[PDB]
Design a protein around this ligand. Structure first.
Ligand SMILES: Nc1ncnc2c1ncn2[C@@H]1O[C@H](COP(=O)(O)OP(=O)(O)OP(=O)(O)O)[C@@H](O)[C@H]1O
Ligand SMILES: Nc1ncnc2c1ncn2[C@@H]1O[C@H](COP(=O)(O)OP(=O)(O)OP(=O)(O)O)[C@@H](O)[C@H]1O
Ligand SMILES: CC(C)C[C@H](NC(=O)[C@H](Cc1ccccc1)NC(=O)c1cnccn1)B(O)O
Ligand SMILES: CC(C)C[C@H](NC(=O)[C@H](Cc1ccccc1)NC(=O)c1cnccn1)B(O)O
Lengths: 196, 338, 196, 340
């Protein structure tokens, strides 16, 4: 359930759900799994917010469990393409593709929350892909293309060697926010700002 | 003579309370208007400069003294003054008032002398209500005033020289005719707050809990064409009146509010008085009334409504509105004659 | 069933729930299980209500069986982040993760209705996580990090030692409203205010 | 012979700073107007010349009227400043489009053969555009016969047409029609064709502080604006007034003949107080005038804003100099050079 409020803006009596209000303040929200249908949404929002103002920062909230690699690199390329700097904030988990999108933000502008979880791991095939050994040789050279491209991506954004990413993403490397700050996924753990 | 801006403001202080930045603006700009007259009518170098007017756009909430600061300014001008509304104006064409009838109001205020009316001040009231988002009374009035606000050889369409059936038009140069325009611009403080306020949201961005920082892009987002704001370089910035100004608006000005109620009770032979705590209690209930100093009247008409009914049916000499009569409706002290 | 009209006004298809009425009075409602989609909703509402007025207190109603840990710490961090104090009110139950959010309110502002229960227990894995023993050693160091993080969260909000949270959340520790006041989850068992 | 376009230019340069393209045009076009009137006395000439009317485009306050008001001051040809918003289609209230010919005949001192060789400046023809629309598209309908040249019966009543009177017959086949307008929604229409998209991959998205110079404008863009296709073809010359940059607005403050800084130094001299500016201050005033975004009119919006605490205090005092600095532009105060 999502309650909807009313904004008395230049017009007033404008009904708005909190997600439209995030997007009005240039906050793209990645809270669902990174699949094609989610990546299609985020890339459309990244191009709209680049068009509305290419100078103001787009903020990307990441509560995603991560997902498809081509959906990852669809969002990744659009985050890197737009003229606006991307401010990635991790809210809860950034796992799999999401931690790559979390590291994909503009340097200086990658945040998490103090109890956020950053889970980096190598690509995996969801379920068994079957076929002839010539088919499987293609699919395995492809997931090594995906594994190398993910580590090359995390090498550009964490400042680590891609072989260091390869040793770290052998298993599920779960980082906390302070551990992902030292790793280079983020560089701000984002202290709480409550007045009390 | 040329009364100085301190002397113009001192006249404005006698009627208008508060409004320092608007009185200083409308005293400086009237003084510059008095100086660009007898510099275009006398001439001297060096490099002899043809001066050009700086029209005024007044902006502030209702009741806060935009029209009243112009009506006060009307009572001191050595130049012709024409007050006019833009809500009656239309673009040249359609049935409403033409934008050269505001010049006719200035020709009529100059006793049909065009050389004095070329030195005049026109006050176009309610230019926030010719605002756009075709519209012929709220988009095309910008388009029609803009030749007048910059200076043109306009000709007034009715009544050229007391209606001779030949040449019903007389010329007027609006180059030296100062224009003071005004309006509440009620939705504009929500527009200005998008820029100078920065209502941010979310992780990172700063979260926060009006007419003095007015850029032309705010007036375009209010809906006014970009040509119309450039003719109005001066923003007067009328402010919202607090409690401490509304207490003074009750009692300090020449035609003050409680001065014209004690005048009403003197027609009943009754000396109306106010405790100073009652004048604060009236102004406490007028800032919540939300209509400026026009809401000071709305309190005192219902504080004095049971008083104004029975007091002219009685023999009394003194009536004292205590603070207990204002915060809730209370009985009447009524000093009997003696 | 939920009674709700649609005013149109030729500007919108404007919906009016009782939840929209609660959200106008700064009441965020956690009435479902804390999953990603619930946590995504609650965090978007906490940031909207911080932006609308960061001084007025957000109220969070909690009638929830509790769910995922990263969805928990998503809501938890966004609660602790915003400048508004958070009034947590327990309705009926606050179990598992939702009792942590109940304790996560501002001190003095954590309420429970008198017949609400507060169910605290250690994190679990719903279902079996398969894998090699190196994968499972990662997943078990994770569930111990989740357990330690939940305990240190309940330590800093109940004023208990985190080892006391260990011995209490070893099994299901169901508290009443008054037992959660003595424990430190809530600060006020909320008295009835009926006229009769 | 019959002042050259470089000579018309250097008169315009004495008043107008910048707009070099829209000063070559209106020097060329006025010289071509002069050569057409010079050819209005004949010997042997088997070819007759046409108007070549001017549609002058540019953003607000950047000098279109001020180009025409300057061009009024040299012209040797009668000159009417008209306004298209004042006009209305015939049969309807308000002025009709034969008033702008009367304003030329009045400018020619009721010498019609001089007014048949005139120049009319119709100001703000972007405001005649897109149920009859008597004040918009209907003005363009009534005005195209005036632009291309017709035997127009002009009422000497003052401008309000009414069917019975003697008229003034004027021929506008040699009257030049400089027309102008802000065209505030046209740079988006031009950008739809000459530019890339405003959105998406492989597009050119632009910052909010950066107008097209109105130099890529074509009638494809002007029909989509709201001008009828008949009105545009009768305006063959495109004059592009450009948005004034910082380097032009620092010159508009101090360099021209009735320059803005010269206006205020004149105002303070009438208080007996010498006004002067540091050059860093004039650059700071022209900085904030691009932020106003109303052209050279935004310069006056700052000079009144900077000198408002000054012009209240100076007439009540005794000073000799004033020195306005960058700090007196970014922070409102007053600090004169108090007289010894
Ligand atoms: N600053 C002031 N000092 C003294 N009296 C004031 C002041 N402002 C308003 N008033 C009183 O309020 C009445 C209305 O003033 P005014 O016409 O200026 O309001 P306004 O702001 O122009 O209204 P609106 O904006 O709704 O047109 C006047 O009769 C005047 O006596
Ligand atoms: N290039 C320039 N050089 C010097 N002064 C200029 C220049 N451009 C504009 N100005 C000044 O700006 C003022 C307004 O100019 P103008 O009357 O041409 O307005 P405009 O921009 O044509 O308005 P609109 O576009 O709405 O017709 C003039 O008084 C003039 O002094
Ligand atoms: C680590 C990053 C790169 C992404 C992680 N896993 C992958 O690489 C994902 C896992 C996944 C997700 C949904 C459907 C199918 C497969 N890999 C792929 O998307 C994928 C798709 N086609 C071929 C090969 N791999 B994440 O989803 O756990
Ligand atoms: C006690 C608090 C921390 C939360 C309780 N349970 C958990 O810790 C939850 C139980 C759960 C819920 C939904 C899906 C999967 C697992 N733990 C997790 O969210 C979780 C998720 N991934 C790995 C390990 N644990 B509650 O939901 O009973």
């Amino acid at each position: 359930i999502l309650p909807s409020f009313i904004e008395h803006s230049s017009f007033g009596v404008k009904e708005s759900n909190p997600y439209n209000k995030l997007f009005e303040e240039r906050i793209i929200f990645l809270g669902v799994q990174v699949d094609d249908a989610s990546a299609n949404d985020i890339m459309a929002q990244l191009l709209v917010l680049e068009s509305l103002d290419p100078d103001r920062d787009i903020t990307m909230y990441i509560n995603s469990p991560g997902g498809g690699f081509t959906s990852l690199m669809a969002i990744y390329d659009t985050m890197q393409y737009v003229r606006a700097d991307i401010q990635t904030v991790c809210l809860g988990q950034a796992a799999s593709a999401a931690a790559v999108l979390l590291a994909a933000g503009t340097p200086g502008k990658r945040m998490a929350l103090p109890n956020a979880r950053v889970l980096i791991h190598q690509p995996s095939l969801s379920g068994v892909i079957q076929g002839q050994f010539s088919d499987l040789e293609i699919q395995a050279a492809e997931i090594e293309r995906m594994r190398t491209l993910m580590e090359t991506t995390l090498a550009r954004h964490t400042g680590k060697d891609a072989g260091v990413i390869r040793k770290d993403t052998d298993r599920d490397k779960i980082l906390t926010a302070e551990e992902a700050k030292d790793y280079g996924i983020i560089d701000t753990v984002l202290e709480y700002r409550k007045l009390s | 003579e040329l009364p100085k801006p301190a002397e113009i403001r001192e006249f404005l202080e006698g009627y208008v309370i508060g409004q320092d930045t608007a009185k200083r603006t409308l005293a400086v700009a009237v003084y510059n208007h008095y100086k660009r007259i007898q510099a275009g009518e006398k001439g001297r170098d060096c490099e002899p400069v043809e001066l050009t007017k700086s029209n005024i756009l007044m902006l502030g909430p209702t009741g806060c003294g935009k029209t009243y600061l112009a009506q006060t300014l009307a009572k001191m001008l050595n130049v012709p003054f024409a007050i006019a509304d833009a809500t009656a104006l239309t673009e040249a064409g359609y049935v409403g008032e033409d934008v050269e009838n505001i010049l006719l109001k200035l020709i009529q205020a100059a006793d049909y002398d065009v050389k004095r009316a070329e030195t005049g001040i026109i006050y176009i009231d309610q230019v926030d209500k010719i605002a756009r988002k075709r519209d012929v009374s709220g988009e095309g009035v910008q388009q029609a005033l803009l030749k007048i606000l910059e200076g043109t050889q306009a000709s007034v369409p009715p009544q050229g020289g007391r209606k001779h059936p030949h040449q019903e038009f007389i010329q007027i140069d609006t180059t030296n005719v100062l224009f003071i325009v005004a309006g509440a611009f009620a939705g504009l403080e929500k527009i200005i707050y998008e820029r100078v306020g920065k209502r941010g949201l979310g992780f990172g961005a700063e979260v926060r809990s009006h007419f003095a920082d007015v850029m032309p892009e705010d007036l375009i987002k209010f809906g006014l064409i970009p040509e119309f704001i450039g003719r109005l370089p001066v923003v007067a910035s009328v402010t919202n009146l607090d409690k401490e100004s509304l207490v003074k608006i009750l009692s300090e000005p020449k035609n003050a509010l409680v001065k014209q109620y004690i005048r009403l009770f003197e027609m009943d032979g009754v000396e109306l008085e106010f405790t100073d705590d009652a004048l604060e209690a009236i102004a406490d209930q007028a800032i919540h009334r939300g209509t400026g100093a026009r809401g000071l009247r709305a309190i005192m008409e219902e504080v004095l409504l049971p008083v104004m009914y029975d007091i002219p049916s009685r023999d009394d000499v003194a009536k004292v509105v205590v603070t207990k009569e204002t915060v809730q409706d209370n009985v009447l002290p009524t000093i009997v004659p003696r």
